[PDB]
Structure formats: C-alpha cells, structure tokens
Amino acid sequence: WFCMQKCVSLVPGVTLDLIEKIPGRLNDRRTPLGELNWIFTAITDTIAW
Amino acid sequence: PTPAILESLISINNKLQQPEAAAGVLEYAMKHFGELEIQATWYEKLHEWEDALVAYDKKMDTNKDDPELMLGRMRCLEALGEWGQLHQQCCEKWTLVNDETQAKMARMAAAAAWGLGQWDSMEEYTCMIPRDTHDGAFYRAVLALHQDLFSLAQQCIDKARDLLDAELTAMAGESYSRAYGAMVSCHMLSELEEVIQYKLVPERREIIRQIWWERLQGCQRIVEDWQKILMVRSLVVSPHEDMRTWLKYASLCGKSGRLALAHKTLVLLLGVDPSRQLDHPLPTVHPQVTYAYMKNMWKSARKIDAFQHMQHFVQTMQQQAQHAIATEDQQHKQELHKLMARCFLKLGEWQ
Amino acid sequence: XXXXXXXXXXXXXXXXXXXXXXXXXXXXXXXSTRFYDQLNHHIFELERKGGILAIASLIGVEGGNATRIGRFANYLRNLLPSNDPVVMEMASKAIGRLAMAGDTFTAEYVEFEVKRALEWLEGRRHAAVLVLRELAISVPTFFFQQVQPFFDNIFVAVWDPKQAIREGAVAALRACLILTTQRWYRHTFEEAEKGFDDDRIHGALLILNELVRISSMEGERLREEMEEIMGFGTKPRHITPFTXXXXXXXXXXXXXXXXXXXXXXXXXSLIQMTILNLLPRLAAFRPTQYLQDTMNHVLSCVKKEKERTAAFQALGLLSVAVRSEFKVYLPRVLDIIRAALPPKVDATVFTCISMLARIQQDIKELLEPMLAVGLSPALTAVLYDLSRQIPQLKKDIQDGLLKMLSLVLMHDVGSITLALRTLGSFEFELTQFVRHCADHFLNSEHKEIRMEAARTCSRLLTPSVSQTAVQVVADVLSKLLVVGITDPDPDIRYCVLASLDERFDAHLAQAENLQALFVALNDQVFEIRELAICTVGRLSSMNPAFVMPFLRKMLIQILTELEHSGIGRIKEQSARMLGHLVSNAPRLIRPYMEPILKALILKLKDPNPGVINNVLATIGELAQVSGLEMRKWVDELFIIIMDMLQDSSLLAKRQVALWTLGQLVASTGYVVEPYRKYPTLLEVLLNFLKTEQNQGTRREAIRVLGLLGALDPYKHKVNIEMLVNMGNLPLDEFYPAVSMVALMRIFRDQSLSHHHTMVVQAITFIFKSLGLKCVQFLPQVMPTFLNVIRVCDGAIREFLFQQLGMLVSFVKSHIRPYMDEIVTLMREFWVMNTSIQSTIILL
Amino acid sequence: CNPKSVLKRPVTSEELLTPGAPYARKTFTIVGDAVGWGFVVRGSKPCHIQAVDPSGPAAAAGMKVCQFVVSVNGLNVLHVDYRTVNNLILTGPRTIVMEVMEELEC
Amino acid sequence: IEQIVVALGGEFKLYLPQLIPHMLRVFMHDNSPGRIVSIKLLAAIQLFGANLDDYLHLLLPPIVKLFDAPEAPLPSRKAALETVDRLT
Amino acid sequence: YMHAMWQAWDLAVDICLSQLPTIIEEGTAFRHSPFFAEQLTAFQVWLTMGVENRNPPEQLPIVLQVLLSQVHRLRALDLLGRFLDLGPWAVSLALS
Ligand SMILES: O=P(O)(O)O[C@H]1[C@H](OP(=O)(O)O)[C@@H](OP(=O)(O)O)[C@H](OP(=O)(O)O)[C@@H](OP(=O)(O)O)[C@H]1OP(=O)(O)O
C-alpha cells in the first residue's frame, strides 16, 4: 500500500519487485523485515492506548 | 636613446603582456649605459627580485637610507618571501619613520608577521593599513578568522569585494590578461569564506580540501600567486595535513630557479635538516617528501651524495615494503611500488 | 480602474486623505498610463494637497519616466508662482522626491529650479528658499554649481523684513557652509558683521554660529542627541538564507554675540528663542565675561514663560561646557526645578537634569519629587541613562522605579500602554505581575493593549531549576500560544509567534505546545504560516518523534501545491514555504532531495516572476544541504541557469540567479571544469561588471568569480580594410572605393529602411560621376541592390526601380549577368497598379 | 626584537591610582564599525593604548595613542593583562564604553 | 464530474490532480449569475469524499475565501458552509 | 485513521526501505532505524517538564516495546525509573 500512494515520488527506484525481495524474516528484529514488524507493533499499540 | 625612453618602453611592454621584449630593453641598457643608469625600479617592474635586491642593497650602502629605497628593498623581500629579514627591517625602523611611509609600510609588515606567525605584531600593522585599500579590508578579515570573529569577518570581506569593484572594472576593460591580478584577489577572498566553513563544519573538511586542491591546479603556476593562496589556506591547515600541495609548490620553486625557497619548503615538510646532519641517513617517514628532496639535491649538483642516498632509500623502501605487506595496506603498497619504480628509474639515469 | 479611481480621488480631495494617498501609493507598488495622467490632472486642477499627494507618490514608486517627467513638470511649474501656505511646502517636498529619483532629467529640473530661485532672491521668495534648502540636502553636487550667486543674492534677500525667509534661508546657509567646510567664508563674515552694525540681530547671530558650530561639532553633537531623546562572536547559520577661518573669526563671532544678548533682551519671543538656542553653542566653543553675559539672559529667561523649554536646553549645554564656574549657579537652577515640577513641558526638564550629571549625592533626595511627577518617556529614558553614566546607586534607582510601576499597575488606556512599554523596554528585577498580566490581555477588548501586553510578557520571560517557575512559565506560555493561535487580529497573532524565540524552545517542544503549533501552520495569513514552519523546523532536533513525521506530511502538501496547482500566487507561496523547510529542517529533507530537485527542475522548464525567484532561492538552499549528493544534476542546473543569466528578457532577477549559482559551485565543488564546458561563463560574468548597477548583484558576480577560481589566461584562450584599401590604391580611386564600402554597410540590415532614399541617390550619383569605371563595383552593388528591391515595401519600390533604370543606363552592356534576376524581379512585381506600370515601362 | 613598543613611559602603576596631578580622566564611548573599532591595547599592567587607526571612528572621537585605560564597558580593568582586555572587548557588545587617562602633555 | 466520482470512487484520486487547476480557476473568476456554477461545484466536492485527503489543502482555501467574502451572495455562502459540514 | 502516529509509520517505512537498493544490489549492511531511539528522546523531553498531572505521554507503550530488546534496554530502564519517581499516579499508569 505504501508503494501505491503518492508518497512514492519521495523514494524513486522503489517498485513492488523490491518489496517482494525484501530481506529478513518477521521474527528476527535485527533484520529489515523484522524491524518494521517490531515498529508496527509499537505504533499500533500506541494509537490504541 | 634615453633612459626615460627605455623606462617607458619597459612599462609599455608589461602592459602589453610581452615580458620578453621588456627584458631585452634591460639588456640594451646594460650594454650601452652600463649599470648606474639602470635604476632598481626597472628590475622591480621586470620581476627580477634577485637583481633588484642586489641593486637596492648596493644603493642603500652608498646612498644614505631613504624612505623610497627602503620600501623598494622591502617590497623585494616580500616578493622573495624572506620574512625573517623583512620583519627585522620593520622592528628596527618604526619611530624613525613618518606617517606617510607608515601607511606604505604596514601592508608589507603585516604580510611578514603573518608569514612568521607572530599575531601580536600582525594586529599592530593591520591597524596602520588604511581601511580604504583592498588590502586593509583583507588583512582585517584575516585577523577576524584568527580570533574566530566570524560575524565581523564576513562584514570585512564584503567591503573588500566592494573595494575590488574599482580594480576589477578597470582591468577588465583592456583584455582578460590585465584582469588576472584582480581575479586572484577574489580567489583569496572566496577561499577565506571556505575557511569559515572549515572551522564550523567537521563533516565538510575533506570536501573543502579536495576543492582547494582542484582549484589551485586551475590557477596559473606563478610562484607569487601560489604563495598568497597557500598562506591563506595555512590559517587552518598546517603543511603536514596536506603534503601534496606543498610538494607541488616546492617543484614550482625548483623549476622557476628558486631552489633556496624550495629547500626551505622541503626541510619544513621533512621535519629536520638533512643539510646539517650530512652523516645521518634521510628520514623514511613521509617518503614522497624525501624523494622530492633527493631530486632537488641532484639539481643542486650534490649528485654523488644524492645517488648514495637513493641506494640507501631503495634498500629501506624494499625492506619497509616486504615487512609491512599485509592484506590491509594494498593501496599503500600500490603507491609504494609506483614510487619505488620511479626511484629505480632515477637510480638508472643517475648511474 | 477609472470610475472608482476617480471616485476615491474626490474622496481624498474632499488622516483619511493621507491614508487614501498611502493606499494609492500601496496600489502603485503593484501597478493604463494615460488614465493615471488623466486622474492626476483631474485632481490637480481642483484639493491642492490631494493633487500633490497624487503626483509625488506615483512618481516615486511607479518610477520617473521621460513621459511622466515632461508632463508633471508643467504641473509643478504652475503651482510654484502662486500657492497657499502648507500646500507650498508639500509642493517643495514633491520637488525633493523628484530630485532624488535619479533620472537623466534631474540635471535639467534641478538647475531649472535653482536658476529661477536665484532670480527671485510672499509665495515666491519662500518657495525659492525651500527649493534651495531641500536641494542642498538631497543634491550637493548641482547645489555647488552656483555658489558665487548663492552668497551674493542671499545676503541681500535675507535681511529683508520677513520671518519665513529668515527661518529657511539660514537652514539653506547651514546646508551650504557644511558642504564648503568639508571640501566664501570671508564674504560671509563681512556681510554678517555689516548686518549686525531688531530685524538685523537674530540673523547675524545664526550666521556667526555656523562658523562656530561647524568648527566644533562637540557643541552640536550634544544638542543633536538630546533632541532625539548583536555580537561579533555569534556563529553564522550553517545554511545561508537568501538576501582656520571659522576659528579666527570665532572670537569676534561671540564678541558681537555677547553684546547682542544684552541688546536684544526683550526687544522685538522669536529673537529670545534664537538667542537661547545660540548662546550655549557659542559658550561650548569658548566659555567669564562671556559666561556672565550668557547667564544674565539665560537665568532671566528660565523664570519667564514661552522660553523655559529652550532655556533648560541651553542651561544643560552650559552646565556641560562650563564645568566648574557653573557650580556657583547651582542653587539658582535647582530652586527653579524644585518649583517647576510640583505643578505637574517638563519632559525637557528631565532631559537637562540628565545632562547636568553628564552626579552629587543630593540627586538621591531629588529622586523623590522626580518619581512623583509621573511616568513619561523622557523620565524613564533619563533614569535609564542616569544609571548608565553614574551607577553609584543603581539598586536605589531600580527600587524607586519598580515602586513607581507597582503603584501604577496596582491601579487610562494610553497610559497603561506606555506603562507596559516601559516595563518591557529596559531591565528590571516579577511573578505576580506576569500572572496578573495574563488576566489583563484576555480581559481587554482593546487591540493595542493586547498587542503590547503580549510584547511585555514575552520580554519579561527572558529569565527562563525550580518547579514553581516552570509551572508558571508553562501556564503563561500555554496562554500565549492560545492567543497566538486563536486571537482574531492577525497582527497580534504574528507578534506573539515572533516573540516565541529560541529561548522558549525547551517549552515549545512539549507535546501539547507542538499540537498548537501544528494548527498554526494552517493560518490564514501566509506570513504567519512562514514563521510557524520555521519554528517547527528549528524544533526538529528537540522532539524529532513528533516534528519529523509532521514535516513529511507538510512536505507532500507543499510539493502538491507546487506541481498540481496551476496558479502563480499559490505556487509562489509554496516555493517560499519549501525554502523555510530546507533551511530549518535539513536532516528531514536530505533523504528526499532527489524527488524535490526533480520537481523544481520541472518547474524551471515550464513555459509570474516571483515564482521563479523563490524556486531559485530554494535550489540554492538545497545546494548546501545536499552535501555532494546533487552532483548528477549540477550540469542540468548549470545549463538552465546560464540560459537564464544571458539577456535581460527573463523576468527573474540576475541577483538571485548569480547567488544560487554561487551556492552550487561552492557546495557541490564544481570548479575549473564548468569553464571548459561553458566558455561564455567568463564573458557573461565580466559583462555584469559593465552593466549591473546594484551593489549586491555586483558583489555576487565577484563572489562567483572567486569560487570558480582564477583561470590561467592561456586556458581562457584555449576555451575561446579601409586602411588596406588606401595601402594599395591611389587617392582618386580610393575615394569611390571607400564611399562604396561605407554605403554598402548601410545597405545591409534594417538601417537601410531609415535612409532608403539617401543611400541610393548617393550610389547613383557616384556611378554617374565615375562613368564606365563604375563597372568595377557591379559585383558588389548588384546582388545587394536586387535583394533590397525584393524586401522593400510601398513607395520605395517605385523609387528603387527608377534608380535601377539609371544604373542600367550607365552600366549598359555590362549588366548582362544580372539581367535574368532583374526580369524575375519585374515579373514578380508587375501589377495593374498604374503607378508601377509607367515606372517599369520606363525601365 | 619581535615585539614593538611605542610607549615612552616605562611604568605608570601606582602613579595613575593616586588622585589628581598628572592626568585628568575622560570617558570615551566608541561605536563599532563594519570592519572594526581600530584600536589596540598592549600594556601589561596599565593596559595603555598601543595604536589607533587614523581613519577609524576612534581617531575621530579623540582617542590618541598616548593614553591609558582602566575600565571597559563598565567593568574595571585597571589591573589585568592586555590579552585579557582584548578578550573582553571582542566578547562584549559592538559599542564599547572606554575610559582614557589622557595625559595632559606631561 | 459527479458521475465519474460515484463510478470510480477510490480510484478517482489518481485523476483529480489534473482537474484541480480548472476548479481553482472557477472560484477566482466566476461570473455566473449568483455564482450558481460555484454552488454546483461545491455539491460535487461533497461527493469527492476521502479522495480529497491528499488535496484538501488545495481545495479548502478557495472554499474558505468563498464563504468569508461579503460581496458574494448568501446562497453561495450557505452552499460553501454546508460543504465544509459534509466534508467534516 | 487520522491519528498523528500514523505519520510516524510512513517515515519509518520510508527510511527502512530506502536502503533496499543498496542492501539487495550493493550488499550494504542494514543500519537500524532511529525510531525507537528518537521515541525515547521524546519521552525524556517530556520528563523534564512532567511534574504536573497533564495528559500522559503518548510514548509509554513504546517504552514497553523497547524493554524487550537489549540495544536500548539500559536507557529505557533509566527513563522508566525517572518516570515512576514523579509520583504514585505515574506508577499506577505504568501498571495499567
Ligand atoms: O621534474 P621531474 O624530475 O621530471 O619530475 C616529474 C614532475 O614532478 P615534480 O612535481 O616533482 O616536478 C612531474 O610533475 P609536473 O611538474 O610536470 O606537473 C610529474 O608528473 P605529474 O604531475 O603527472 O605527477 C612526473 O611524474 P611521473 O613520472 O609519475 O609522470 C615527475 O617525474 P619523475 O618522478 O619520474 O621525475
């Protein structure tokens, strides 16, 4: 969804194909993919509270 | 043929950017009129600073000391860069001098103090320079950056540019060549702007140095112009922090037939005097500097000693290479081989 | 633009009229030409004050032009011969504004008024005096052009029995003798002393004072300052935002003045006023008999009325000039001051008590009546400058002054205004007052009270660890932010926001305060919007967790207004706003620099001047922020900017063009190589030095030649017949050849159109006089002459064909090579038009 | 020989401090300029004025070379080093309040 | 326009930026008797819905100038106010 | 949907996958996001003027999430203690 918004102009050279091939896992918080999952959990729990 | 005519002929040639013709006029004077008719000012116009100093020394020995001959000889000393002798003549003669010559003195006295790095003397002299002059603004802006008065520095630079208006406009009218002198003034002003950034932005430092290096190579290879520019950059960059600048400078001094200045420069970079300790071996720290010293020594006709040093140096180099070759220092090894190669070639041609 | 422009014209013709002239000047700042001349003529003939307001205001702002000068000069020349008072001085101000316009006709207009002023030397005499006085101030050079007529005519005309001339002509002589000193004096002293030997008193004294006052500025510099009554170590911002005979005769000057002060004691108010002005300045040059003659007139004038104001001014100068000998008359002066104050004019009395110290412990007792007088701007200026010069009891001064303010603020509107201005002007030693001032501004419907109470509280929070003080500052600053967001009057909102400086950034970075500031970034007023984004950008280091997400959303909106809004003003405002963001939040913008720069380059390649000017100022600020990441685009922006630098057609100012180019070369480090790529760069930048008149622009054009380095002259060389005619030929041949060559140059280009008739009449006469030797010139003349016939229009065609006929009659057989072209010409331009038919048949 | 000394008076300590006799004090307020004030103080104990720019604002408002100072911008600097006074004037405001001893030709 | 908005719905925000320049010119210079073409364009903006998110900063100033202008007629001012109500 | 924290999520994503060209192609080491660091900085700034019983800090649940790692655990444990010090009202919040 981030790659479908108008805000992609701010990051040229970011297509869906790069999102498919994002490295990491959803467990390892030291990887790039696990970083986002960890951040996302914090942001959502903050909005709710 | 008259001396006045010959003098005017010389000044005309310099304005027309024909240095060789004006030199020929001095050769004519030498033959047909000898030496007494040749004033020292003629050498000054021709940029014969060595012969002008000899002339001003001969004149100041016989004739009693005069304001005009003192300023003429002092002007020669600043062009040569003999800041030691130039500052000695200043300190000796201040109360003995009038306020008119005082204003014609301080512009040269401040240059000498700045060269020697005595900032208290430099402050005294700069105040004596008139504010209406380009130099008066420039030297006030320099003592601003020494005291970190950034706000006042920028102010003084702007007035300096304002005073360069008159000079830039006049020289631009009659060819680019005449405008070059003014162009160098703005060069030094905009370099002083990039010293304020250098003192404020640690992240910008290596960029500024690269810009400085590329800019100086576009500038003309005249030794006077380089000395001015290097003295400015030396406000925040010691010569050790940028070797290649001062080595290229020494090479120009060598090519221009001023090996004495080249020697001083190289001694300052080496750290010690090999000239004094002839028996000792040359220091290996900063090898590119040492190599420049040896090829200078060869030009100085100490060619048996130079050759011997090169044999010692290459043995040191090849041992310093072998023992220090790890995987890490690969760029250093590649530069050390490029050096050793040029060393071996010099060895051969010298042999 | 015509009907309502004439409706408000009669409105301003018939406070309200000055505001209608200021609004007309404000409308002239944005701005047909014929209708403005008719509207000025409509207001002129009718009233006279509004006509001068129409003329002078437009000329200054819209700019003097040859059309406007030629027309309005007749209007000004008609007013001067006969006019009313007050209107005359307004017309003289319209002369000064015209004379300082800086036009080519200024030389003619000024010397036209000066020559007629000398002819006169009563609406004629006083008009010439006001013209010469204002021109002497504004234009020293052309005022000096007639100095010998100046002195000779004026020393006759001054001593006529008139008052308005004596007031102005001495001020004109003042402006003249100052210009003479810095660069006549014997003829001045002779005619002045001849006049002294009661109309002929107060004028000679002023002339003698001019030689005394100019010789010693120490006397005047004290009077000039009393009438009116950053840091060098600061680090500049890392991103630069866009931007003899008068001393020898001085003895007789006071000698004839010491007797004049006794002679004209109470003869013919006006003379006593000028005496009490001059006496201190003469005494400051040379102070006892001179002092005794001064003291008799001065002390007697203090007890009297209508002079007490100027008397203390002279008395204050006398106390500074005459130090020790004045101490005898201290009991006299202090008794008059102790009697003058109880009645409460006295604003000057305090100013001179400050000059009396400019001391004794008696002043300590003098404070208790001084403060009991009341709050005045003179009093608090004195006590402030009193603690500067003599800080013996600075604490006791602040003790009484704070006690006075406390008595006042424990308790109409304009006094509370000035009391707050006092409270916030100079330093003090304040909790209840500020929590009580938080009540006053909220509960005041007066606009000026709210605006000043805001300025006061923001100044009094300069002392900004105790929890109570923090909670107080938090309360006050929350109320201030509410006023800065919610107040209807946008001036008050702007003042409050501007007052929230760096000092408060520790408090502004709180969540609640930041939520208010965000609302403020959508203010109706663009200027307030600009100021808010600057504050939030500055806080992006304090609380990045809030500020950095919000500036990203704002950045998207800014770039939306740029790209998608098709409107000049909105795009101009959007670029300006992106300027403040780049400068204040460079960390945020660095990752997004390539998108922003592509958007801006696209705006530069679009087919309003202020939009391009703000876009260039933003790109320049991006240069420094980019930090060598913009190199790939440098060659693109260099083409664009060099395209915009050359020629004056482009609306965008060269100044900002040259400034942004500087910042690119500087930050990105493109040196020497641009000279090779763009060789005209050195020809463009040395052309500005011969063309530009602005200093700032010329300054940049040098700073950019600096950063680009000094090119070696050879590297610049790599980057880039009339005498011969005579050298060969004899003179009898040379003269035709040089005549022809000179005619051929005119034949080409559009210059021929102006001189069509004369050029060809010459060439024909040349060929006729030569004979058959003209055949030589045929290959030159014919191809041009035929192409001239092709592109000529109307009447000239017929004439050219007539003269071609003459040519052909002379050339005769030699015309064969060009005959084919001539036929084609004829074939094309043969028409049924009777005129050309007869012409061609003759040919 | 590197330093330059233009002051004939060898020492003035304990002579200034005594009231009256050789000199009469005066206070000079000098406004800053675009390029600087133009005065130098190089007195060890008394902080005498070393030189004054003849074209500068200071020379216009008196400020002769042969002078001594004891207070700058209010603060009394009668007994400090010359370098310390140079720090105070630069770190201070643009306009400087200066007291000049102004010896009366003695 | 109103029919394209109901047809596409969420996908209209891709094409709205092209139309914005013309809509902003309508407000600046509307000579329609009683500005009834403005009132119609307000009624359209109500349909735009959550499409206006990324472009509300563009549309809103014209709408705000419309209902604050005293010279403008009362019908067109009520239409602007009711539009802001809906969009809220 | 219109909460301010959503804007932070966009920036976090932007910075995280602006490195992907260099991570995939160049093989650059993935630098971690400053998000959690900057959020603790905001909580610290709040504590400075947090004596009053104002609106609680938005970042309290983030401080909890930070405790799970070790990278920022020392800083969080410090700040969390300083917060609890403020009063018993704050300890009640941290327990809720
Ligand atoms: O004067 P030379 O003895 O012939 O030495 C030259 C000279 O070097 P210096 O800077 O010491 O004078 C060249 O410099 P230029 O003055 O011509 O600019 C330099 O060339 P570069 O500037 O390209 O380095 C060249 O070096 P190289 O052989 O690597 O091309 C080097 O030659 P030697 O080191 O062999 O004497």
Residue numbers in the entry:
A (entry chain E): 277 to 325
B (entry chain B): 1408 to 1758
C (entry chain B): 17 to 30, 37 to 53, 60 to 74, 82 to 156, 162 to 223, 233 to 246, 258 to 289, 304 to 317, ...
D (entry chain J): 304 to 409
E (entry chain A): 1056 to 1143
F (entry chain E): 374 to 469
From the paper:
DEP domain-containing mTOR interacting protein (DEPTOR), conserved in vertebrates, modulates the activity of the serine/threonine kinase mammalian target of rapamycin (mTOR), a master regulator of cell growth. mTOR acts in two functionally distinct multiprotein complexes, mTOR complex 1 (mTORC1) and mTORC2, and DEPTOR is the only protein reported to bind and inhibit both mTOR complexes. DEPTOR is a 46 kDa protein comprising an N-terminal DEP (Dishevelled, Egl-10, and Pleckstrin) domain tandem, herein referred to as DEPt, and a C-terminal PDZ (postsynaptic density 95, disks large, zonula occludens-1) domain. Biochemical analysis and cryo-EM reconstructions of DEPTOR bound to human mTOR complex 1 (mTORC1) and mTORC2 reveal that both structured regions of DEPTOR, the PDZ domain and the DEP domain tandem (DEPt), are involved in mTOR interaction. The PDZ domain binds tightly with mildly activating effect, but then acts as an anchor for DEPt association that allosterically suppresses mTOR activation.
DEPTOR-mTORC1 overall refinement (map 4), focused refinement on symmetry-expanded protomer (map 5) and focused refinement on one protomer classified for the DEPt region (map 6) were used for modeling and illustration. The core architecture of the cryo-EM reconstructions of the two mTOR complexes in association with DEPTOR largely resembles that of their DEPTOR-free states. In the mTORC1 and mTORC2 complexes associated with DEPTOR, the mTOR active site adopts a non-activated conformation and is not occupied by substrates. Inositol-hexakis-phosphate (IP6) was recently found to bind to mTORC1 and mTORC2, albeit without clear activating or inhibitory effect, and its binding is undisturbed in DEPTOR-bound mTORC1 and mTORC2 complexes. Binding sites for short linear TOS and RAIP motifs in mTORC1 substrates remain empty in the mTORC1-DEPTOR complex. Consistent density for DEPTOR is observed in two regions of the FAT domain of mTOR for both mTORC1 and mTORC2, in agreement with a regulatory effect of DEPTOR on both complexes. DEPTOR binds to mTORC1 and mTORC2 in virtually identical manner via its extended PDZ-linker and DEP domain tandem (DEPt) regions associating with the FAT domain of mTOR. Indeed, we observe weak residual density in the DEPTOR-mTORC1 complex at a binding site for helical peptide segments of substrates and the inhibitor PRAS40 on the FRB domain, which might represent a dynamically interacting segment of DEPTOR or copurified interacting proteins. Indeed, such an alternative, substrate-like weak interaction is indicated by residual density observed here in a known substrate recruitment site for mTORC1.
